[PDB]
Write a protein that binds this ligand. Sequence first.
Ligand SMILES: [K+]
Lengths: 123, 128
Amino acid sequence: DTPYSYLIRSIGMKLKTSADARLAELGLNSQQGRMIGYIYENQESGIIQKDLAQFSITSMLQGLEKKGYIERRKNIYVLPKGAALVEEFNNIFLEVEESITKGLTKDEQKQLMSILIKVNRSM
Amino acid sequence: LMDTPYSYLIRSIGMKLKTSADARLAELGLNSQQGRMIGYIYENQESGIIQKDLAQASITSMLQGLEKKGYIERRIPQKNIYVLPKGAALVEEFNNIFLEVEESITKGLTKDEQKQLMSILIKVNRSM
Ligand SMILES: [K+]
């Protein structure tokens, strides 16, 4: 009896499947991926260990250093391997996005975009 | 987040619905998983529900909590789980919250847009 909410939740959950599988193949968790992402995003501005505590973190950074994702040290920087990973995950999300229209006709593709915009605007 | 436009909107709408719902439930010291669980029990109890069927957040803890608060009981027909009247009243308040959230999805849409959205979302969900 709440079919729109059910479909929105379920599709929303499926948007994450490919990313979770890659994290697992790489031996990383969601906290590690996000941390690498956060550092990649903010390292030019400059980020220190305190900043990551407020947005252990010591042991995680050590794990990420051992995997060659983060530079050993003071500001924190991802290594090229870390930047490459962020790019990889972005591309995963692009492939998932492209899959949304797989089962849809041209008209359905346009209508979905128009309607989702309207729904999102209304709440 | 806006580099993947459909995904952006789907998650934005999802997160807005969930925030609406989590907040309206939280005031009642409830959460959506408890509501779903009680609802499932209420709907299927005459079929015979055991803890195993619910397994397939700690389920044992959540069931003990619902039982301690007087919402469900375990009856000797493995014991079967049933909603008590206080729990049936609570299912209805849960359901009404979910129904108002559902209606917020379609407020701004024509009947045709509602029909198109249902049809399309079924297809998208099937395809992945
Ligand atoms: K297609």
